[PDB]
Paper text:
By contrast, the integral membrane protein EzrA was identified as an inhibitor of FtsZ polymerization and its absence results in the inappropriate formation of multiple FtsZ rings, not only at mid-cell but also at the cell poles. EzrA comprises a single, N-terminal trans-membrane (TM) spanning helix followed by an ~60-kDa cytoplasmic domain15, which sequence analysis suggests forms an α-helical coiled-coil. The BsEzrA22–562 and the shorter SaEzrA24–214 rods comprise multiple copies of the same ~100 amino acid, triple helical bundle; BsEzrA22–562 contains five such repeats and SaEzrA24–214 contains just two. Although many proteins are known to comprise bundles of antiparallel α-helices, EzrA is, to the best of our knowledge, the only bacterial protein that is formed from serial spectrin-like repeats.
The crystal structure of B. subtilis EzrA lacking the N-terminal 21 residue TM helix (that is, BsEzrA22–562) was solved by selenomethionine single wavelength anomalous dispersion (SAD) to a resolution of 3.95 Å. However, through the use of highly redundant data, the experimentally phased electron density maps of BsEzrA22–562 enabled the building of 96% of the 540 amino acids in the structure. The only regions that could not be built were six residues at the N-terminus and a loop between Ser177 and Asn190, which the sequence predicted to be disordered. Overall, the BsEzrA22–562 monomer is a curved rod, forming a complete semicircle with a diameter of 120 Å. Groups of three α-helices pack together along its length, except at the C-terminus where there is a four-helix bundle. The formation of a semicircle confers the potential of the C-terminal four-helix bundle to interact with the membrane at the same time that the N-terminus of EzrA is embedded in it through its N-terminal TM helix; this can be modelled trivially by manually extending the N-terminal α-helix of repeat 1. An anti-parallel dimer is observed in the BsEzrA22–562 crystal lattice as a result of crystallographic symmetry. The dimerization of BsEzrA22–562 in the crystal buries some 3,300 Å2 of surface area (~9% of the total) in an extensive, molecule-long interface. The principal axes of adjacent repeats in BsEzrA22–562 intersect with angles of 37, 38, 33 and 53°, resulting in the pronounced overall bend. However, EzrA is the first spectrin-like repeat-containing structure in which there is a pronounced enough bend between a sufficient number of repeats to form a complete semicircle.
Numbering used by the authors: 24 to 176, 191 to 559
């Protein structure tokens, strides 16, 4: 039922709003009028309102709801129709209102922009007034520009203005940058070409044919880039690409400069790598070390033996080799054609070649000097081994059973048979430390590993003696077992007495391995 009221509402609304806006066509915003674009809408506004004076009385006709007051089903079927119609009209109205609130906008706005546009064309006449470099295209541009501005004198005109903005932007985007642009194709293009060719002209005191291929070619690339830049600018193309080309060129140039400074470096490095050949004679003191190698005649004659007199001569071989590499390097260097830079890789090796050999001859200096000390610590070791052997030899008393019956005439017949070797050592004149060291590796762990076992045997004998010394003859089955130990020990067997005192631990307290072993450890 209330739908009827809503129907009145969206009728009063549309009618009053349309009355107002149609009333607001001649009595408002009437200022400005183009006799072309306006006469289009001066008909569109008519027919658009001619619609609503036909499509609203259709709604008036369709007020059958007044009669259809008996049903509620046929109601909405002839109601939503109408409401959607009203929506269809008022959606076609606000479209118009937006149309006009643009035409009145797209005039009054652009009417305030032509001021700035003319203001800019006043500052482009001036900026080309005083100019003759590159002022052939500028004339054409200014000309067409002012032709356009002369043409603008509605919406089409707005568009033309909006064109002229961008056009102006391009005009001073030109007039600003182009000054410096040509200014490099006159004093900064040959300004660098001259500096580089005269560069080579100077670098004719430090340059080779090896670089007569990858050197003079980059100028053949540059001399292209320049003409490419020119063909860019002088043709309708603009700062874009060309301003990049200048960068590319600059990169090329300074790359070349770096390449030159690197050979200045290679030239300067030699002056610190060929006074290293001054030390190449300071290490030619072979005949000063081979005189130090004439104290073989007085002592340590193993210098004259292998693995010692050798190696040094091999370092004389190495010194000959590097000595030849030097002459080859200088020979290659001192040519009628100038020197260059590929030499650096050929000397970095040589610095190492001396760095090593020097340390080698140093090592052999040390080796020679050490021998005089080697036959001292050796004398210490032997003079000690004698003491050890003595004391253990005397320790081999008191133990009523002759120790290691098999290993007695074995590890003691190495006491005499590895001292007569030392007789041969410190009696030799000149002696040799190899003959000494050999009969010392054969002296180590053959004196000790014969004293350890012996001391363990003495310990064992004293122990067992003090064990049976607590032999308890008062027992009947322990005594007769104890007798089976004496008869076993007085032979020549080291296990015969092992299970011996194990019996003496299986009839005596748990502290049997501590009964005697403690008293002994006192």
């Amino acid at each position: 039922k209330i739908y009827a009221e809503i129907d009145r509402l969206e009728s009063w609304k549309i009618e009053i709003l349309n009355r107002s806006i149609v009333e607001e066509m001649s009595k408002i915003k009437h200022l400005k009028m183009t006799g072309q674009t306006e006469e289009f809408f001066e008909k569109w506004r008519e027919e658009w309102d001619e619609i609503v004076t036909a499509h609203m009385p259709k709604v008036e006709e369709l007020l059958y709801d007044a009669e259809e007051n008996a049903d509620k089903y046929r109601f909405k079927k002839a109601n939503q129709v109408l409401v959607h119609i009203d929506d269809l009209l008022t959606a076609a109205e606000s479209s118009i209102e937006k149309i006009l609130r643009e035409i009145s906008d797209l005039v009054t706005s652009e009417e305030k922009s032509r001021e700035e546009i003319e203001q800019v064309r006043e500052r482009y006449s001036k900026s080309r007034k005083n100019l003759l470099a590159y002022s052939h295209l500028y004339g054409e541009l200014y000309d067409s520009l002012e032709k356009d501005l002369d043409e603008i004198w509605y919406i089409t005109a707005r568009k033309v203005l909006l064109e002229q903005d961008r056009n102006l932007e391009r005009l001073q985007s030109y007039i600003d940058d182009v000054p410096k642009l040509l200014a490099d194709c006159k004093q900064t293009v040959p300004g660098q070409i001259a500096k580089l060719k005269d560069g080579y002209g100077e670098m004719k005191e430090k340059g080779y044919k090896l670089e007569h291929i990858q050197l003079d070619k980059e100028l053949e690339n540059l001399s292209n880039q320049l003409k490419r830049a020119e063909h860019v600018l002088m043709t309708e193309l603009d700062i874009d690409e060309a301003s990049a080309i200048l960068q590319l060129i600059d990169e090329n140039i300074q790359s070349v400069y770096q390449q030159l400074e690197g050979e200045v470096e290679a030239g300067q490095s030699v002056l610190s790598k060929m006074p290293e050949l001054i030390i190449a004679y300071d290490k030619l003191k072979e005949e000063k070390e081979h005189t130090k190698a004439e104290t073989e005649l007085v002592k340590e004659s193993y210098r004259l033996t292998a693995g010692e007199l050798g190696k040094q001569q091999a370092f004389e071989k190495r010194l000959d080799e590097i000595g030849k590499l030097l002459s080859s390097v200088k020979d290659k260097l001192d040519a009628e054609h100038v020197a260059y830079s590929l030499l650096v890789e050929e000397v970095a090796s040589i610095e190492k070649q001396i760095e090593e050999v020097k340390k080698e001859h140093a090592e052999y200096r040390e080796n020679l000097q050490a021998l005089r000390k080697e036959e001292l610590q050796a004398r210490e070791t032997l003079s000690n081994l004698k003491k050890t052997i003595s004391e253990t030899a005397r320790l081999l008393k008191t133990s009523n059973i002759p120790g290691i019956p098999s290993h007695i005439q074995e590890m003691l017949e190495n006491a005499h048979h590895h001292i007569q070797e030392t007789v041969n050592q410190l009696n030799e004149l000149p002696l040799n430390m190899e003959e000494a060291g050999a009969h010392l590796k054969q002296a180590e762990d053959i004196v000790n590993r014969a004293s350890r076992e012996s001391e363990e045997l003495v310990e064992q004998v004293i122990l067992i003696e003090k064990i049976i010394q607590f032999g308890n003859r008062f027992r009947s089955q322990n005594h007769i077992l104890s007798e089976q130990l004496k008869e076993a020990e007085r032979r020549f067997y080291a296990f015969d007495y092992d299970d011996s005192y194990e019996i003496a631990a299986a009839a005596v307290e748990k502290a049997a391995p501590g009964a005697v072993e403690k008293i002994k450890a006192d």
